[PDB]
Amino acid sequence: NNTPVTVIGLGPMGRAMAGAFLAAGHPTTVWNRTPGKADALVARGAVRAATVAEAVAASPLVVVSVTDYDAMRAILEPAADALAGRVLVNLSSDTPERAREAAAWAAEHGADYLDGGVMVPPPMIGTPEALIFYSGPREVFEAHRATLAALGGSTYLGEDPGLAALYYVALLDLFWTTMSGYLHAAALVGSEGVPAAEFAPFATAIFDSLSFLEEMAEQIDAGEYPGDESTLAMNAAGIDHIIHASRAQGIDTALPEAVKALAERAIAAGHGEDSFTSVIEVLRKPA
Amino acid sequence: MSNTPVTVIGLGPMGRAMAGAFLAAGHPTTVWNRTPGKADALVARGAVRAATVAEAVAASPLVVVSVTDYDAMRAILEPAADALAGRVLVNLSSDTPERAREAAAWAAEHGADYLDGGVMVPPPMIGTPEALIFYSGPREVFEAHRATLAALGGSTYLGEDPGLAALYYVALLDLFWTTMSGYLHAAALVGSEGVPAAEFAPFATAIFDSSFLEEMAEQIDAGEYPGDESTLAMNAAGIDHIIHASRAQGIDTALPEAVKALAERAIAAGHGEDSFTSVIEVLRKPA
Ligand SMILES: NC(=O)c1ccc[n+]([C@@H]2O[C@H](COP(=O)([O-])OP(=O)(O)OC[C@H]3O[C@@H](n4cnc5c(N)ncnc54)[C@H](OP(=O)(O)O)[C@@H]3O)[C@@H](O)[C@H]2O)c1
Ligand SMILES: NC(=O)c1ccc[n+]([C@@H]2O[C@H](COP(=O)([O-])OP(=O)(O)OC[C@H]3O[C@@H](n4cnc5c(N)ncnc54)[C@H](OP(=O)(O)O)[C@@H]3O)[C@@H](O)[C@H]2O)c1
Numbered sequence: 001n002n003t004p005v006t007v008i009g010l011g012p013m014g015r016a017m018a019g020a021f022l023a024a025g026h027p028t029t030v031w032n033r034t035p036g037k038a039d040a041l042v043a044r045g046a047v048r049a050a051t052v053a054e055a056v057a058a059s060p061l062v063v064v065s066v067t068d069y070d071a072m073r074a075i076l077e078p079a080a081d082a083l084a085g086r087v088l089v090n091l092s093s094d095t096p097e098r099a100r101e102a103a104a105w106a107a108e109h110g111a112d113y114l115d116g117g118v119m120v121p122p123p124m125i126g127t128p129e130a131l132i133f134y135s136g137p138r139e140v141f142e143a144h145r146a147t148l149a150a151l152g153g154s155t156y157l158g159e160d161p162g163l164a165a166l167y168y169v170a171l172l173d174l175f176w177t178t179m180s181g182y183l184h185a186a187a188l189v190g191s192e193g194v195p196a197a198e199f200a201p202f203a204t205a206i207f208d209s210l211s212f213l214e215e216m217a218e219q220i221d222a223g224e225y226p227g228d229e230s231t232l233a234m235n236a237a238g239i240d241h242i243i244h245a246s247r248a249q250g251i252d253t254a255l256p257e258a259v260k261a262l263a264e265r266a267i268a269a270g271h272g273e274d275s276f277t278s279v280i281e282v283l284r285k286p287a
Numbered sequence: 288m289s290n291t292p293v294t295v296i297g298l299g300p301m302g303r304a305m306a307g308a309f310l311a312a313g314h315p316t317t318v319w320n321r322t323p324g325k326a327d328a329l330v331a332r333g334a335v336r337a338a339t340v341a342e343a344v345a346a347s348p349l350v351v352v353s354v355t356d357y358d359a360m361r362a363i364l365e366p367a368a369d370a371l372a373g374r375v376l377v378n379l380s381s382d383t384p385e386r387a388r389e390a391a392a393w394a395a396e397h398g399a400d401y402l403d404g405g406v407m408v409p410p411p412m413i414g415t416p417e418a419l420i421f422y423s424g425p426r427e428v429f430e431a432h433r434a435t436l437a438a439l440g441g442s443t444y445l446g447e448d449p450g451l452a453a454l455y456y457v458a459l460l461d462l463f464w465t466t467m468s469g470y471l472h473a474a475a476l477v478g479s480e481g482v483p484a485a486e487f488a489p490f491a492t493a494i495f496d497s498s499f500l501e502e503m504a505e506q507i508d509a510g511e512y513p514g515d516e517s518t519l520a521m522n523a524a525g526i527d528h529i530i531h532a533s534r535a536q537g538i539d540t541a542l543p544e545a546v547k548a549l550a551e552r553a554i555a556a557g558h559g560e561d562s563f564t565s566v567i568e569v570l571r572k573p574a
Contacts, residue, residue: 012516067521068528094528096480097535119490121497131493166480167490169532170473173543175494176526177469179563180546182500184465185458186507187570192384192454196504202407202455203462205419207495212467213488220474220484229300237355238460241382245457248385252570256461258545259468276467283475286539 002026003147006059008052008075009066010037012122013091017063017151018046020126024150031055033075053079056086061147063116065091069098073105084110087140089148091116095169096162103136103161112140115161117168118151119175125151135163184246184255191249216277225271225278232279233272236263289313291435294347296340296363297354297380298325300410305351305379305439308414310334312438319343321363344370349435353379353406357386361393372398375428377436379404379420383457384450391424391449400428403449404436405456413439423451472533472542479536503564512558512565519566520559523550 002025007018010032018041021028030038031049038048049055056062056079064072072092076083088111093099099115106113114136124130130152134141141148141156148154157163182203186196219225225232242256262279265287271278291314295306298320309316310332318326319337326336337343344350344367352360360380364371376394378401381387387403394401402424412418418440422429429444436442445451470491474484506512529543549566552574558565 068524094525095532095535097532119494124497129497131490133490160480163480163482166477166482166532166536167487169529170476170487171490171494172525173476173529173533174466174469174473174491176522176529176546176563177472177542178466178494179503180549180566181462181465181469182503183507183564183567184570185462186504187567188458188461189454190507190567190571192448192451194451194454196507197501199455199458200500200504202421202459204498204500205407206459206463207466210492210495213470213492216467216470217474217484217488220471220478234355235464237382239464241356242457242461242464245383245385245454246461247573248383249454250571250573252549252572252574254574255465255545255549258541259464261541262468262539276464277471279468280471280475280478283471283539283542284479284537286534286537287541 001146001150003061003144004029004059005147006031006049006055006062008032008055008062008064009071009092010034010041011065011067013118013125014063014065015041016122016125017065019044020150020152021063021147022046023126026147026150027059029055029058051079052076053082055079056082060086061089061144062086063089063091068092068094069102072102080109086110087112087114087144089114089116089134089144091118093117093162093165093168096160096165099135099162099165100160112137113161114140114144115164117164117171119168119171120152127152129153131155133157133164133167135159135165136161180255184251187251188246188249191251219275219277220280225274225276227274230275231273232263232266232276235276236260236267236272239263289435289438290315291349292317292347293435293438294319294337294343294350296320296343296350296352298322298329299353301379301406301413302351302353303329304410304413305353306334307332308438308440309351309435311414312435314435314438315347317343317346319363340364340367341370343367344374347374349375349377349432351377351379356380356382357390360390368397375400375402375432377402377404377432379406381405381450381453381456384448384454387423387450387453388448400425401449402428402432403452405452405459406439407456407459408440415440419443421445421452421455423447424449468542472538475538476533476536479538506562506564507567512561512568514560514562517562518560519550519553519563522563523547523554523559526550
């Protein structure tokens with residue numbers, strides 16, 4: 001496949017995507033608002049477009065990887081009319097609603113539109129280990145799936161453009177919450193002189209089974225959260241201990257308190273005898 | 288390799304696993320539980336069910352206690368407070384570092400040696416090399432009994448402070464329940480569009496496996512948080528999208544609101560251009 005491709009936005013993700021398109025043999029044209037981020041890509045045969053319009057004109061497939069909808073629109077407005085008949089693959093949707101605005105805006109200028117999302121480190125881009133997911137017209141995805149495969153694995157999610165954006169914010173939700181839990185744990189143990197370097201191996205070990213993911217999934221889908229011998233009321237006591245320990249060590253407690261509140265809400269609704277997974281019930285209900 | 292008599296007090300899932308491990312390693316094992324009926328499989332494998340706590344403590348130089356918390360541990364051991372002198376008490380059920388210290392001081396006052404233990408694995412892992420149990424307390428005591436504790440799995444000494452094992456335990460529990468909650472928020476995010484959890488899990492599992500925990504520990508230990516190409520200010524704006532997407536999907540927003548509030552504190556402290564790891568600077572500071 002030698003379909004020409006354009007990549008707009010050369011943050012670390014845009015650069016890895018352009019690099020992957022080149023490595024797969026596509027003629028790649030790149031553009032960034034800030035000059036000087038394209039040197040390695042040019043050295044590997046990318047063409048550095050001088051204007052957005054020239055960038056859009058170079059390819060039937062335009063991949064946009066910039067901060068958000070507002071940046072995407074300001075970038076592309078001067079060349080909006082040049083989008084007619086091309087496919088815009090957008091990895092810059094900050095919300096499911098903005099993705100649908102973006103799809104509509106693209107439609108009013110003659111362009112098909114896929115929303116895209118990937119939650120992997122840039123270096124994994126262009127390897128089978130990168131899982132990229134898309135939503136939007138299935139016929140548009142099927143038509144370009146072979147070019148997009150240069151980026152890694154591809155998953156079609158369905159026709160609603162906001163789907164990919166929804167998955168991305170969810171994964172973003174899991175990531176930053178996880179990262180915050182880690183830093184809270186490091187501060188907890190740090191309050192006794194335990195260096196984060198010494199604690200990190202225990203922390204990573206916590207994540208080596210990843211069994212909880214399928215088991216919680218199966219519980220959520222079946223709508224049944226069998227408590228067994230590690231119930232939610234038990235788990236709430238554990239989170240109490242986190243709070244107590246945090247207070248007594250000087251560490252801030254806002255984060256474990258928020259977790260506590262969620263568990264309490266689930267116990268106040270009769271799941272105190274169910275597994276932790278049953279907390280999804282109160283999460284579906286703004287409080 | 289054993290026949291050393293071991294007593295296990297508390298026959299919840301962990302205690303039964305531990306008693307089974309001691310039996311498998313060849314140790315004459317006495318068990319006692321508040322609730323009768325949970326010892327049948329252990330007695331078939333050779334364990335002795337003790338009539339009373341006092342009898343169970345007396346049976347063995349080494350007394351392992353895995354119950355809910357210190358308060359329960361103290362309730363059961365009250366009638367056996369005389370029998371304790373001359374033994375070592377291995378507490379695998381301290382809820383907080385402070386309760387572990389209280390336990391140690393209480394054991395000392397009754398003529399008993401004291402080791403605090405933190406178990407970081409599910410009960411099925413106990414007794415296998417996948418189990419890693421950390422201990423704190425007097426090194427001599429830990430050394431003299433390591434060969435018996437080896438029946439449970441790996442053993443790691445953390446230091447002389449008896450609260451250390453509990454600290455590691457609660458920090459790991461803090462990372463665990465915070466991650467679970469993030470995962471459920473995510474799942475509730477996609478679920479609000481009819482997406483099955485079953486499906487979403489593949490992408491969540493990829494978050495892990497792809498890591499940087501050791502990278503953030505280096506930064507924590509240096510006290511230097513280089514922003515590079517993803518600063519705290521950009522991460523916070525991202526978290527804002529999570530909140531906004533959550534409100535639009537009608538999901539509860541308490542958990543991401545809590546992550547965002549932590550980010551905003553570190554930005555108010557002047558870390559907006561540093562990496563997210565700099566948020567630890569406001570965790571060490573009760574707010
Ligand atoms: N898949 C998704 O749905 C999705 C959505 C958002 C973010 N992300 C991920 O988040 C990470 C980084 O997020 P990010 O892309 O916001 O950060 P980033 O790495 O800083 O990339 C932002 C890009 O947007 C450009 N940009 C921003 N505002 C602009 C404007 N007003 N006019 C022109 N260009 C503008 C920047 O150009 P300059 O070089 O000129 O600054 C840069 O190329 C990446 O891993 C990315 O994949 C994924
Ligand atoms: N996988 C795990 O669950 C896990 C992992 C690591 C560490 N731990 C720790 O190991 C310990 C035991 O946990 P577990 O998994 O076995 O489940 P658990 O539900 O914490 O076990 C509670 C045990 O304490 C006893 N108990 C509670 N209150 C009592 C009281 N007032 N008087 C007398 N006995 C009382 C219970 O006896 P009854 O049977 O009569 O109720 C039971 O044997 C806890 O400290 C827990 O944090 C557990």
